[PDB]
Amino acid sequence: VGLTTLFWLGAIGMLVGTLAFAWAGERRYYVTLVGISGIAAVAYVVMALGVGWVPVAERTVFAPRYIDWILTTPLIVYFLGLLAGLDSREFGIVITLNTVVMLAGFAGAMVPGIERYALFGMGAVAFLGLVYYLVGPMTESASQRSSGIKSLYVRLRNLTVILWAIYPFIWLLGPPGVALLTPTVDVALIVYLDLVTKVGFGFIALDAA
């Protein structure tokens, strides 16, 4: 099982999700889910073709992964913000916090020296602030909606919080960090997480609709 095989698997999974969401497509929600998995599909194909594998010191960094995350994770937060009924100002805070996490990870991965752990730490701090907004203010806000919408928000929120919290550990234990986990295992774990936090996320929304 090679890296390219794992990338192709993620590509196929994202593509199936993309077509499923487009078919089922309230247009805003369905269009967002197409963007979430559609962008990831492209990133995985590019990586499957061997494009964007950047050598850094003694590790290999996958640049398309971080461009993907920077564009798709704010769309996931946007989806959750619509469910919770955020005003346009609360959106700005959480999307700003999200972008800090994603940019810090991208920069830390691309830096060869130990300064990269300083960048990782900053993303960790901003992530804790993002979790606070999901579990607190956004949950208060979602409470004002129908019982079914509130229930859907809580289920997507917990899926999001629990799984997103695993990524920094995979990053740190993998090549970008202490380089303990091997690239193949590290990639396999992230392909699984990407698929669940995007396509699984999406199908839980379809089921409730």
Ligand SMILES: *C/C=C(C)/C=C/C=C(C)/C=C/C1=C(C)CCCC1(C)C
């Ligand atoms: C579809 C892709 C998803 C949901 C990716 C999520 C990625 C994260 C939650 C990554 C978080 C990170 C930290 C909290 C600190 C810095 C390193 C990151 C980017 C792995």
Ligand SMILES: [Cl-]
């Ligand atoms: Cl990486």
